[PDB]
């Protein structure tokens, strides 16, 4: 329900439904590819909801539970470059390039982050 409301460009009810999904599964089974999807979709909704702090928190949680994830590191680079945390942005972006050298957007993101850091 959260995913379909997100796809329907109606994020507010998607956010509440994914929050309900998280709170139902919060107490049990942190592993088993369920909490991972819940937290990832919730972080995506928050980043599309323009609220970044809790999105970064959930992305950090899933990165803790799974480090082998190029998409996660690209998302952290996105969120950190949205804010002015350039060091974390470039670190996670380099991690993503390490995870997958041939990333289309990540090259441009790295160029922009380096240019902004130098000009800062």
């Amino acid at each position: 329900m959260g995913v379909m409301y997100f796809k329907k460009n109606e994020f507010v009810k998607a956010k509440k439904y994914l929050k309900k999904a998280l709170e139902v599964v919060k107490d049990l089974d942190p592993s088993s590819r369920t909490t991972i999807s819940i937290q990832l979709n919730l972080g995506h909704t928050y980043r599309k909801l323009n609220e970044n702090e809790i999105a970064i928190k959930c992305f950090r949680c899933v990165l803790e539970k799974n480090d082998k994830n190029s998409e996660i590191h690209c998302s952290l680079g996105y969120l950190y470059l949205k804010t002015k945390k350039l060091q974390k942005a470039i670190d996670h972006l380099h991690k993503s390039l390490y995870l997958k050298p041939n990333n289309s957007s990540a090259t441009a993101l790295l160029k922009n982050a380096l240019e902004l850091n130098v000009t800062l």
């Binding site: 995913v3 997100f6 590819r33 369920t34 999807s37 819940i38 990832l40 979709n41 995506h44 909704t45 599309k48 998409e71 690209c74 998302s75 996105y78 470059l81 949205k82 289309s104 957007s105 441009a108 993101l109 922009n112 902004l116 000009t119």
Partner: peptide, 30 residues
């Protein structure tokens, strides 16, 4: 039961292009 893998949200290229552009005019502002 064979539970389907839950669908996952992806970071689209359009939104990241929009954000990097907005950052470009943001640095061009000052």
């Amino acid at each position: 039961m064979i539970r389907r893998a839950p669908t996952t949200l992806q970071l689209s290229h359009d939104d990241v292009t929009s954000l990097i552009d907005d950052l470009n005019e943001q640095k061009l502002k000052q």
